[PDB]
Amino acid sequence: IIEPSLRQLAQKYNCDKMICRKCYARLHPRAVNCRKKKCGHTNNLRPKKKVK
Amino acid sequence: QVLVLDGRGHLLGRLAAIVAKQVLLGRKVVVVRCEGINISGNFYRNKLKYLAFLRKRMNTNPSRGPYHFRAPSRIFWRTVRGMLPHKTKRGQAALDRLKVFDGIPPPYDKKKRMVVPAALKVVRLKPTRKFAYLGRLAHEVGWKYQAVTATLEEKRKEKAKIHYRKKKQLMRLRKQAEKNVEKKISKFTDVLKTHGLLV
């Protein structure tokens, strides 16, 4: 078990992310375009899905 | 007799273009410090260029060529060869008028080095552009004497520094001497100033 505050700390680094739909790059939560050239800096981002 | 050039801070292809035309007119050229030569563009895209060259080999017998020389001097030499008609007697004669060196071995270490401002990186590149170092590029494609050449180039610079201090000393005496004998040489100093030699 993890203290809920520490869980939020870990989630900031493992869960609170956006995911490029074309190249799956991990991105900061406020990302609007990917940072990778391989996808042409697309704006087709989606949230990193939450673990159940 | 011999045109000695210093490869540090020169862009590879512009130096080769000028050097090639020079040895085709019958002049001897020595380029030293080929590891100090530069290439425009980031290092990585220039490393990929040599790796692409490195893949060119006779599929049925690699020993028959192309020969991929790894020394910064030989890389430069092959680049000048690519700007000459080397399959004719006239081109091969020119190619023999060029010597290329990593570092500055004798006797050129104790001779004055000229530069080519039309190939200098400070002149020809925008300051914000990336560039590669021939020595680093050569070191990362199989060149083995980067560490030794630097070791011997540091010994040379230590000796050249002592030589420079001796020359500054002999110049401080030269200025003092001109004050001591100012009375006796004043007449000859007027001739020179009258004609622009001395300001």
């Binding site: - | 599929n59 049925t60 017998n61 690699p62 020993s63």
Partner: protein
């Protein structure tokens, strides 16, 4: 088959007849099990029990 039609040459990587053996070779990691002493004459006796 010593090659395909193209390249129209025999490649350096195809098996051919020729010299076998008498090749220079370097082999590593051969452990020393014993450094044996040579024969000695001591007090008029040959000492040779190095095995």
């Amino acid at each position: 088959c010593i090659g395909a039609w193209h390249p129209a040459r025999v490649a350096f990587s195809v098996a051919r007849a020729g010299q076998k053996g008498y090749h220079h070779r370097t082999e590593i990691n051969k452990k020393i099990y014993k450094i044996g002493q040579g024969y000695l004459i001591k007090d008029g006796k040959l000492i040779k029990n190095n095995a």
